[PDB]
Design a protein around this nucleic acid. Sequence first.
RNA 1: AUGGACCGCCAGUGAUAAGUGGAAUGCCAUGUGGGCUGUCGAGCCCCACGCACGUGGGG
Length: 244
Amino acid sequence: SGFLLRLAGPMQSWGEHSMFGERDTLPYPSRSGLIGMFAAAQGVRRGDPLDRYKELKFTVRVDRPGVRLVDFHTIGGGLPKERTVPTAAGERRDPKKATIVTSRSYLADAVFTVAVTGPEADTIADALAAPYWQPYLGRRAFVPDPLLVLRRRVADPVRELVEAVPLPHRRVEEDAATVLVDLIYETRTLTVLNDVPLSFDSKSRRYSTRQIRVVPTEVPATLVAGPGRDYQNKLFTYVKQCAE
RNA sequence: AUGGACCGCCAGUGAUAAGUGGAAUGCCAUGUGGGCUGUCGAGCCCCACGCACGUGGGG
């Protein structure tokens, strides 16, 4: 069981440890984010129990790391002296000091191939194919890849990440095989981070620590696509035999 | 419905005033394009007259 989401598109930003103006993202997706996306695809309002999404497994193969960019983001500026974002007491600020400036970072031009393995994976897949809310990647303004769900049904999808999945073009030496690609499994762990989601309600966001271990694996060089227009093509023909 | 949902960095601006590329210069000295030559029967149809050899009219 399981399916292979294809995390790609113009921009991605999985945030963490940022409860102020300055927002930051991780160099790889976080289960809280994509579990929020499945939850958004199944129609569970914030505050509902998320126990159903427990018992899931997410190994993610990073195709390209992508470069980090900072997004400057001012909110409430230029508006007249009687329209901004109120204060808790209700007394607005002076228009010269009214707007609030947040500089939210984001990860750009990267593509990940996650491998979901869970008991509810089939309904999750069928929910992503038709959701009850626009599914996004990190934040609402980021639009996901069209091929959000690369392969809908595969037994042992991890083996599919280790072999027979298209990769974007990169420098490959002559008649060289064994090109390394990093994938994260969850001793010899890399880091601990607040990912497991316990509650999404806006009144009390509650998360917990989760282990992460990045293993650099080797893949045969027969997956690297060509210079341009070849990668998207090869992945289309790859998603073509999904019916078969 | 994802440390996310809502969300503008942004309202003003001459790059400006001045300027010869200029004075000098044979592309030249040499060449057959040549031998050879008479311009003297399948066509598609109609009609008319016919000595069944043909003759003329309209397409």
